[PDB]
Structures are given as C-alpha cells and as structure tokens.
Ligand binder design. Structure first.
Ligand SMILES: O=c1ccn([C@@H]2O[C@H](COP(=O)(O)OP(=O)(O)O)[C@@H](O)[C@H]2O)c(=O)[nH]1
Ligand SMILES: [Mn+2]
Length: 342
C-alpha cells in the first residue's frame, strides 16, 4: 500500500536532520513517497528542502497572512498557524494527491531505523479495526529507565492520542476536516467528541524522538519530559510478526486479564524496590489525587487530557520501574474517563 510521509516544516533548517533520517531508512521510494509541506516561507529552510531534489516533493502552504485570534489567545498565534497548516497539508495529501493514509511527521522529529517497517506492519491493523483511529511511534513514558530494552517489538493500545509520528486513514480526515479547530489541534483530537472512544497503537520503545527544543512552544515541556524519550535503535521486523494480539477483541480480554491478574503492590514497595520476586505488579489508584500522587512517585507523566492519562488504556498506564513491569491502574470497575480529572 502507498503510504506517504507528510513532513510538516516552517522555519527551522534542522528539517535537514529529519529528512536525512527518513531518507536513509526508507525501504522504498514508491511505497513511501515523502511530501514536505512548508509553511512560513523561510528562505533558508526552503533552500534546504529544495536541495533534496526529487527525493521529496516540496509543497508550500499558500496563505501566509496573520490570523485573527480570539480574545483569550493573543500569545498563541503560532498555534493558530500550526492548525491552519495541518488543515491545508492534510487536504493536499487526501484531496489533491488522494492517498489512502499518511504518516504525519513534524520537522523536529528523528525517526528510528524501523520507523517504516512499523507503519507498514500496522497499517493493515488500522484498516481492519474501526476501534483504532491511529498508529503512533511515540511512547509518552518512553524514558530509557522506563522501557524494557529486551522487548523492542512490544506494542500496546492507548486511549491517549500521542501524535509525534502518527498514521491516519483518509477516512479519519473525512471525519475531522469539517470541524477542524482554529488552534491546539492535538488537544482537540484528545477530546471525547473527536476521539469517540477510539485507540491508537503505540510502542514499548518510541520510533521517534524530538530535538525541537526551540519551536512554537516554550521549551519547558521539552526540557522536563520530551527530551528524555529514548529512540529505538534495534530494528524489529514488524512485518514478520503476528500482531493479531492488538485487535480489540483479543487485547481487551488478554491484556486486561493480565493487568488485573497481576498482584497488587502498594506504591511505596514498588518505589523502594521491595518484593522483587514480583516481576509484574499493579499499583491501584482510586481517584484523581491518588493517580497524580502515584504517577509522580514512580516518575510517570501525571497530566491528563480530557481525563485520559498519558499512554493510558482503560485508565491503565504501563511502564517499567527499576526493571519491574508496573500497571498503574484503576479498580476493575472502571467504566469510562471523566474529563473533570484535570
Ligand atoms: O507558523 C508555524 C509554526 C510551526 N509550524 C509547524 O508545526 C509543527 C509544530 O511546531 P513546533 O515543533 O515549533 O511546535 P512545538 O512542538 O514547539 O509545540 C512543526 O512541524 C512546524 O514546522 C507550522 O506549520 N507553522
Ligand atoms: Mn516541536
């Protein structure tokens, strides 16, 4: 299947780093055409993209005008521009070029060696399972000490849309475009009105890493969290593996049985590495305060978007802690996310 890589660029010449890695690992130019959509009009960045010649297709967002923002958004013009560019670029991919799907890659992302293999293998899953709405290369809790380096092939389902290197079908763009927001597109997709209970596939070890310390957003989130996500460097032949375990029917039975069948341990014992014979445990939280307290105690991202925790699935956040597999989970009576958990 032909799956274009849509690279979103603007005014950072470091799009070079992004393109160099994509082109180095690309297994087929025919199967993975690279389309670089550039906003802003920055000359140096345009020259960098143009220098790749026919290895990429360079297109330019046509409307470089300033955008009238709402009264609460004077400091956020950049986010309005990002949203406008996404709408135009995705429109080019799905309306002009008429591709069936696309992997969206921001210009400050470096991909892993098996980035293409991963999407080639998971595309069929996304096509077949309507309960999935994306495949993402990003593990929100993918810091080196929180992932199992011996399981680079392990994948999961997540209710938290990760973005940062993600595959979507033309069918999803059909649903999103008519109501595309003025700004903050990713948090908008995280709302239940958009997500509609759908999940994304995400890996144990991230297939992308960001180097965009300087960008539209102030660098604090990058400095405290994003910079620490470990990029996978061990090539996994995903197309040769049986990924049927990711189908909702199998996953919701097996993964959930696994989580709730695991012994429960108090957060303090997990933290101080007590009871090491229990290689897989569950740390149960019962409310917003305990979730944030326990997440923080174990070094897990503790913010919530529309009530969904980072990398969470049915409220469960799975990660490694000092070599132990941990599932920070709600009681099994869990029955939906509460957006008021902020
Ligand atoms: O006016 C702009 C500013 C940025 N971007 C793009 O939108 C993405 C997000 O930008 P950035 O990485 O700077 O955002 P941050 O991660 O800092 O929130 C990148 O692909 C940029 O090239 C854009 O299309 N138009
Ligand atoms: Mn960025």
């Amino acid at each position: 299947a032909v799956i274009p890589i849509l690279v979103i660029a603007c005014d950072r010449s470091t799009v070079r780093r992004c393109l160099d890695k994509l082109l180095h690992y690309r297994p087929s130019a025919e199967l993975f055409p690279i389309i670089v959509s550039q906003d802003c009009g920055h000359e140096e960045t345009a020259q960098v993209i143009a220098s790749y010649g026919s290895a990429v297709t360079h297109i330019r967002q046509p409307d470089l005008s300033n955008i009238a923002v709402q009264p609460d958004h004077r400091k956020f013009q950049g986010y309005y521009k990002i949203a406008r560019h996404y709408r135009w670029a995705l429109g080019q991919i799905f309306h002009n070029f008429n591709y069936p799907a696309a992997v969206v890659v921001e210009d400050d992302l470096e991909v892993a060696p098996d980035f293409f293999e991963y999407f080639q293998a998971t595309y069929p899953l996304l096509k077949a399972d309507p309960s999935l709405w994306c495949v993402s290369a990003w593990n929100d809790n993918g810091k080196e000490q929180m992932v199992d380096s011996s399981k680079p092939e392990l994948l999961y389902r997540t209710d938290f849309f990760p973005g940062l290197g993600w595959l979507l079908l033309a069918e999803l763009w059909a649903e999103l475009e008519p109501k595309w927001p003025k700004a903050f597109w990713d948090d908008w997709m995280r709302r239940p009105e958009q997500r509609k209970g759908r999940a994304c596939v995400r890996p144990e070890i991230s297939r992308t890493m960001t180097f965009g310390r300087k960008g539209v957003s102030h660098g604090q989130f990058f400095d405290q969290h994003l910079k620490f996500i470990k990029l996978n460097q061990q090539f996994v032949p995903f197309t040769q593996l049986d990924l049927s375990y990711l189908q909702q029917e199998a996953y919701d039975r097996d993964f959930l049985a696994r989580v709730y069948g695991a012994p429960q341990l108090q957060v303090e014992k997990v933290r101080t590495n007590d009871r090491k014979e229990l290689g897989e445990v569950r740390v149960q939280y019962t409310g917003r305060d305990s979730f944030k307290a326990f997440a923080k105690a174990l070094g897990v991202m503790d913010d919530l978007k529309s009530g969904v925790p980072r990398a969470g699935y049915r409220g469960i956040v799975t990660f490694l802690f000092r070599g132990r597999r941990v599932h920070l989970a709600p009681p099994q009576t869990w029955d939906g996310y509460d957006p008021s958990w902020t």
